[PDB]
Design goal:
Layout (H helix, E strand, L loop, with lengths): L6 E2 L4 E3 L12 E3 L5 H4 L10 E3 L1 H9 L8 E3 L6 E3 L2 E7 L7 E6 L5 E4 L21 E4 L13 H18 L3 E7 L5 H11 L3 E2 L2 H8 L10 E2 L7 E5 L5 H10 L6 E8 L16 E3 L2 E7 L6 H11 L3 E4 L6 H18 L2
Parallel strand pairs: 2-3, 3-4, 4-5, 9-10, 10-18, 11-14, 11-15, 12-13, 12-14, 15-17
Antiparallel strand pairs: 1-2, 6-7, 7-8, 8-9, 16-17
The structure holds nickel (II) ion (NI).
Subunit structure: Binds constitutively to TP53BP1. Binds CDC27, which is itself a component of the anaphase promoting complex (APC). Binds PIAS1.
Organism: Homo sapiens (Human)
Protein name: DNA cross-link repair 1A protein
């Protein structure tokens, strides 16, 4: 049974609700982005209308085999009528194809569903500037003040400078980057660009990247591993055993691995500056965990909500425990008393 925080009142609509069977009264299923916890349940046998971005619809058709007649892609930043209700899709600053959804209800209520997002001051000059929002369905993944991390630009600077130094010292070093979903493509693309290399990967991952509308992508990626000195591997293989085994497969072309694990937040964030991050090393293998986030920090979340001034907040992450729910509600009330709405 579909939880209440996935249902849009006064409509036939649900958001990210594909694992509950046929939801009673649902006439259109929205999908915010192509991450498995959100698309869980979709397959080639799905027969109701799915509403999403163009990039999400490419992934549904090629990766999950959803038939074309049920995929309804919408352009961004454009007023659209769906089943009699005005909607807008906005860039969520999450992974490729990820959107927030603005719903203009027939009774005059306006609802914003963030999906998953990384709040940014540029959102204060989107189509959100133009009218009031009554209800906010909020990605609360990092809703606590301990969750700090750097900008994506600082993290990429660290990665590029680290990789360029290592491979210039040793031209026989291989760089490896972990992945297990779409998102965070800038990590491996920025490193390959500084090294003058294409990124090498499996046929399955190449197929996925070919769905993303990234400009000039054919110039940047390849399935020919032998031609590349930046390789992508599954995240599970980013450990000393997995990496030793990969280096064996490269036929004595390389004699050192430098590997990156983009995580979200880890508790090494509460003590250490990005500047000061060091790797774990065993022999000729070194592994860096880098805090590249595609979700809001606490401070970015608080600035967005204090700007928007919603009448009601419905969290969509960390909803399973009473302690989490009570913590989130306390911060919402602080924010509202501080700003005066
Ligand atoms: Ni996500």
């Amino acid at each position: 049974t579909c939880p209440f925080y996935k249902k849009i009142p006064g409509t036939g609509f649900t958001v990210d609700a594909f694992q509950y069977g046929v939801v009673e009264g649902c006439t259109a299923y929205f999908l915010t982005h192509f991450h498995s916890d959100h698309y869980a349940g979709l397959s080639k046998h799905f027969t109701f209308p799915v509403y999403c971005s163009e990039i999400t619809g490419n992934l549904l058709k090629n990766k999950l085999h959803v038939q074309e007649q049920y995929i309804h892609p919408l352009p961004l930043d454009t007023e659209c009528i769906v089943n009699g209700v005005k909607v807008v899709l906005l860039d969520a600053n999450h992974c490729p194809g990820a959107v927030m959804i603005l719903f203009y209800l027939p009774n005059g209520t306006v609802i914003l569903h963030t999906g998953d997002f990384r709040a940014d001051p540029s959102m204060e000059r989107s189509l959100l500037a133009d009218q009031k929002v009554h209800m906010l369905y909020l990605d609360t993944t990092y809703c606590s003040p301990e969750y700090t991390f750097p900008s994506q630009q600082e993290v990429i600077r660290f990665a590029i400078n680290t990789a360029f130094e290592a491979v210039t010292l040793n031209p026989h070093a291989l760089v490896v980057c972990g992945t297990y979903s779409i998102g965070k493509e800038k990590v491996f693309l920025a490193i390959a660009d500084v090294l003058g290399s294409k990124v090498g990967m499996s046929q399955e991952k190449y197929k996925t990247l070919q769905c993303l509308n990234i400009p000039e992508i054919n110039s940047l990626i390849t399935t020919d591993m032998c031609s590349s000195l930046v390789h992508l591997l599954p995240m599970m293989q980013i450990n000393f055993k997995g990496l030793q085994s990969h280096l064996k497969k490269c036929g004595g072309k390389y004699n050192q691995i430098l590997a990156f694990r983009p995580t979200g937040w880890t508790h090494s964030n509460k003590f250490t500056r990005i500047a000061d991050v060091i790797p774990q090393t065993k022999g000729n293998i070194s592994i860096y965990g880098i805090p590249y986030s595609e979700h809001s920090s606490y401070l970015e979340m608080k600035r967005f909500v204090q700007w928007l001034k919603p009448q009601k907040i419905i969290p969509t992450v960390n909803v399973g425990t009473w302690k989490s729910r009570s913590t989130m509600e306390k911060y919402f009330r602080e924010w509202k008393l501080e700003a005066g709405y």
